Amino acid sequence: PIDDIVKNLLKFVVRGFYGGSFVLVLDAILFHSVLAEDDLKQLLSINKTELGPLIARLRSDRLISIHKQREYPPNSKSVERVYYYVKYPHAIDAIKWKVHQVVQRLKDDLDKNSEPNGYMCPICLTKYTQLEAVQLLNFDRTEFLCSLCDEPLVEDDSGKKNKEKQDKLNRLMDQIQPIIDSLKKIDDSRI
Amino acid sequence: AATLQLGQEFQLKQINHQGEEEELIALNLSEARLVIKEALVERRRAFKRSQKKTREKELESIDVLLEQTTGGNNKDLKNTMQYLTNFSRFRDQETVGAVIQLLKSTGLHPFEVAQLGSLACDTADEAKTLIPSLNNKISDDELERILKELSNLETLY
């Protein structure tokens, strides 16, 4: 079943960009379709302080949403059981959206450091740019002054940092490859 | 920019002091230079009216004749004329009029057509890269031939 790969993918990201404890609750929720609240509680045998945000993260991750699995109490009351409805369609909605968000962000970091164009005065600790440089450039001053401190300017965003963002990208592409490949394998059916 | 969107002071809807509209007033660095002396001579004519109570040799002195007329803190005017005359490739004001009759018959925005005149341009592709706005506005065949007609009007002192 492809839905298992979705759950299998959910383990990867919840263990790749999250901790190990983030998958045991993910295991527990997906262990049973309609699982009682206490049954999950006895599995971990720890406090709710180490369990609450894990489900809240998963509900915020939109992979699984706690559903109102209504149960009729036997004591002339109505107390429901907290069974999560694993929201597979929203999983690809949320998780992939971040991947698209981070990749363009790291793409932004690439061209920011790609070539040193903006300038800066270390005395004033303020960045500048070429358009500021030219209007500040003088025939006598072959460099760029800083009228705020009356100091020469220095360049910013040297060529080294462009490699760092690319190396971030290369790690980004490699480390998200198992996530996306397991995500794009779901794109065939959208389940 | 190159999208024919400059400051609103340079739209087609240009307004005189009396509210009347006409297309933008744009001149090439030769046609403008031609109007420079003649208008200034009129002021020098008015200067003397109130006073009563190659091409490089004549370049400076004529401009010096008018540098003497005004305050002269506009020696850049000479420099502009130096920028103009060294780079203005027209003469014989009737040349512009036919060129205006010619270039503006194409329905081109006067800054664009003046840039055709102002730039020593020969080919259609030459205008394809120099003037990005004027690449496909007109068929490039017309470009060269009109430029060649202008290239036929090369007056080289």
């Binding site: 690439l110 790609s114 290369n170 490859q177 996306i180 794009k184 794109d187 065939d188 | -």
Partner: protein, 138 residues
């Protein structure tokens, strides 16, 4: 294809292959829009196609998508032969055998160019194409 599509989106066969995984005419590898657009915007930069160093040129690319780039390059070499022999005298007199012989020569020029195993006529074919271009220009 299945896993060779991009330095960024490598497994792009099932990753919504909608972005142009175009091929630079001087790079001959699948480069996704996530990658190529980062490159030609600034100019002739090289792409990290598994650590590749070939230059992705300026805004002068071509469409090659899912047409066996290597064979397409051979087809392009054939197309280059077809372009070099666009005005080649084959049936100027109508002789079919001569055209059959002439067709073999143009294909051999493509064959020399598109093979690369021991390509030495390939450089000569370019000179022959230049000779053809000399015939074509004059």
């Amino acid at each position: 294809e299945n896993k060779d599509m991009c330095p960024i989106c490598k497994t792009d066969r099932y990753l919504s292959p909608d972005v142009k995984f175009l091929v630079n005419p001087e790079c001959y590898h699948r480069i996704c829009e996530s990658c190529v657009d980062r490159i030609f915007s600034l100019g002739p930069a090289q792409c990290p196609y598994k650590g590749c160093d070939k230059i992705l040129r300026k805004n002068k690319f071509k469409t090659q998508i899912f047409d066996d780039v290597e064979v397409e390059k051979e087809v392009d070499i054939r197309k280059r032969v077809f372009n070099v022999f666009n005005k080649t005298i084959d049936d100027f007199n109508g002789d079919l055998v001569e055209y059959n012989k002439y067709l073999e020569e143009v294909e051999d020029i493509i064959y020399k160019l598109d093979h690369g195993i021991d390509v030495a006529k390939t450089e000569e074919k370019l000179r022959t194409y230049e000779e053809l271009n000399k015939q074509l220009i004059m």
